[PDB]
Ligand binder design. Structure first.
Ligand code: NI
Length: 341
């Protein structure tokens, strides 16, 4: 049974609620981004409208095989009417094609649903600037002050350097990057670009990347592994036994892997900076964890919400326990009292 925080009052609209069957009264199904928790349930057998970004559109048609008619792509940053309701999609700064949705209700209420987002000062100069938001459906993934991590540009710096170093010391070394969804494409594209290479991947992952409207993408990626010195692998495969195995397959063409596991937060964020990172090392395979986040840190979230001064906040993440629910409300109260809304 679809939860109340996946429904939008005074509409027949739902958001990311594709796993319950037909939600009675729902005329329209919004999908914020192509990640399997959010899309869980979609198939070729959907015959209700789906509204989403062009990019999320391409992924629905091409990866899940939804029929072109039922995908309604909308441009971003454009006042659009949908069943006589003004909506806007805004870039969520999450993974490719991810959006936040502004709902302008008939009664005069304005609601922002963030989806998954990494809050940023650039969003304060968007269309949000123009008017008051009464309700905020918030990605609370990292709503706890422990949750700090560096900026994406910081991480991309570290990564580029590490890789370019090792490759220039040993030109028969291979870069590997772990991956299991869309998101975090800048890690492998920035490396591949510093190294004079295309990125090489399985057929499935090439098909996934070809839907994302990346500029010049045909010059950046290949399905010919042999020709590439940056490879992608299933994140499941980024370990010693798995990297050993894969190092066999390349057939005496490289003598050292240098891998990256872009993760989110882990407990080593609490005690070690990004400029002081190390890898594990079982012989010639050296795995780096790097905390490249596509979710708001505590402070980023805090800033966004205190600028937005929403009259009410509704969490979409970590809502499954009363302890997390309670904990999160305390933070919302502090922000409000600090800020004087
Ligand atoms: Ni996500």
């Amino acid at each position: 049974t679809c939860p109340f925080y996946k429904k939008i009052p005074g509409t027949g609209f739902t958001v990311d609620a594709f796993q319950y069957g037909v939600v009675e009264g729902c005329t329209a199904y919004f999908l914020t981004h192509f990640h399997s928790d959010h899309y869980a349930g979609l198939s070729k057998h959907f015959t209700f409208p789906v509204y989403c970004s062009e990019i999320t559109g391409n992924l629905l048609k091409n990866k899940l095989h939804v029929q072109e008619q039922y995908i309604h792509p909308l441009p971003l940053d454009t006042e659009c009417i949908v069943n006589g309701v003004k909506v806007v999609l805004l870039d969520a700064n999450h993974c490719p094609g991810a959006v936040m949705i502004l709902f302008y209700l008939p009664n005069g209420t304005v609601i922002l649903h963030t989806g998954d987002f990494r809050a940023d000062p650039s969003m304060e100069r968007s269309l949000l600037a123009d008017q008051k938001v009464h309700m905020l459906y918030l990605d609370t993934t990292y709503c706890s002050p422990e949750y700090t991590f560096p900026s994406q540009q910081e991480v991309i710096r570290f990564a580029i350097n590490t890789a370019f170093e090792a490759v220039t010391l040993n030109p028969h070394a291979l870069v590997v990057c772990g991956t299991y969804s869309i998101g975090k494409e800048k890690v492998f594209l920035a490396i591949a670009d510093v190294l004079g290479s295309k990125v090489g991947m399985s057929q499935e992952k090439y098909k996934t990347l070809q839907c994302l409207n990346i500029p010049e993408i045909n010059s950046l990626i290949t399905t010919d592994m042999c020709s590439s010195l940056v490879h992608l692998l299933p994140m499941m495969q980024i370990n010693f036994k798995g990297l050993q195995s894969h190092l066999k397959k390349c057939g005496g063409k490289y003598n050292q892997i240098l891998a990256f596991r872009p993760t989110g937060w882990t407990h080593s964020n609490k005690f070690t900076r990004i400029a002081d990172v190390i890898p594990q090392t079982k012989g010639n395979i050296s795995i780096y964890g790097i905390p490249y986040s596509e979710h708001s840190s505590y402070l980023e979230m805090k800033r966004f919400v205190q600028w937005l001064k929403p009259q009410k906040i509704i969490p979409t993440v970590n809502v499954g326990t009363w302890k997390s629910r309670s904990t999160m409300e305390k933070y919302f109260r502090e922000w409000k009292l600090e800020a004087g809304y």
